[PDB]
Ligand binder design. Structure first.
Ligand SMILES: O[C@@H]1[C@@H](O)[C@H](O[C@@H]2CO[C@@H](O[C@@H]3CO[C@@H](O)[C@H](O)[C@H]3O)[C@H](O)[C@H]2O)OC[C@H]1O
Ligand SMILES: O[C@@H]1[C@@H](O)[C@H](O[C@@H]2CO[C@@H](O)[C@H](O)[C@H]2O)OC[C@H]1O
Length: 228
């Protein structure tokens, strides 16, 4: 079978919570966060892990659901991790950049990381995503471009500077399983070490460096887990 079974059956189930300001919480046993720097935005999170996103006139908007840790353990200490996801794109406009896939942070060192399988922007992210282009790698059965960046901006520690790690899929995928730890393994070979893990979540991010992005996105499947 070319695809995962959840690609055929995914739909929103369970109890839900709609948030319309910056907010971290849990719904059932899944961690969620809405974060934006501006705009009239929302997100609806379901106890089955799935979620949906709206953004209006935003500079940078993130909606994410999955695992929240306490920044005490490296990924290797936590265990091997994966995320199952299904994205359904909807209408959007003035989306200058966007990432869809898995996202999180470490501390010690402070790093934001992305495994990007799709994007709400008209075109995929380009070489501007990072100052260091490590090149093309076969990771988790597919071709990804790996980048490292240094960014000054908001963070889980407040406004500061931090490295970012990216794997950008060369061919968009709208449904499947990301082997998160396989990306971590590749990054380590390239000098991109993971600190103590803060989170690992399915993410939709959309933004624009000058204007204000608007649109919606649906994630009828999103499940992040420790195991196989
Ligand atoms: O981690 C996120 C960053 O990746 C994001 O960085 C901005 C991404 O957009 C960059 O500008 C692009 C230049 O190329 C044009 O064709 C695109 O339309 C532009 O978006 C900008 O330089 C980066 O800073 O910032 C938000 C972070 O969460
Ligand atoms: O109140 C602060 C939040 O605004 C901050 O949120 C993080 C900011 O950087 C973004 O890239 C992250 O996604 C977001 O979680 O977290 C720290 C908190 O004190």
């Amino acid at each position: 079978a070319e695809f995962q079974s959840f690609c055929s059956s995914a739909s929103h189930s369970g109890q839900s919570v709609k948030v319309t300001g910056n907010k971290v919480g849990t719904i059932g046993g899944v961690g969620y966060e809405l974060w934006a720097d501006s705009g009239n935005n929302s997100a609806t999170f379901y106890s089955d892990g799935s979620f949906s996103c709206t953004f209006q006139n935003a500079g940078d908007y993130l909606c994410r659901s999955g695992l929240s840790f306490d920044s005490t353990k490296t990924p290797s200490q936590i265990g091997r991790m994966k995320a199952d996801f299904k994205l359904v794109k909807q209408n959007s406009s003035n989306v200058g950049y966007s990432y869809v896939g898995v996202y999180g942070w470490t501390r010690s060192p402070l790093v934001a990381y992305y495994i990007v399988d799709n994007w709400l922007s008209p075109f995929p992210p380009g070489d501007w995503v990072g100052n260091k282009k490590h090149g093309s790698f076969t990771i988790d059965g597919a071709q990804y471009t790996v980048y490292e960046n240094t960014r000054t901006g908001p963070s889980i520690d407040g406004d500061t500077t931090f490295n970012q790690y990216f794997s950008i899929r060369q061919q968009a995928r709208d449904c499947g399983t990301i082997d998160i730890s396989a990306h971590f393994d590749q990054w380590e070979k390239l000098g991109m070490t993971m600190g103590k893990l803060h989170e690992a979540k399915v993410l939709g991010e959309a933004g624009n460096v000058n204007g204000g992005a608007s649109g919606t996105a649906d994630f009828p499947y999103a499940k992040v887990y420790i195991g196989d």
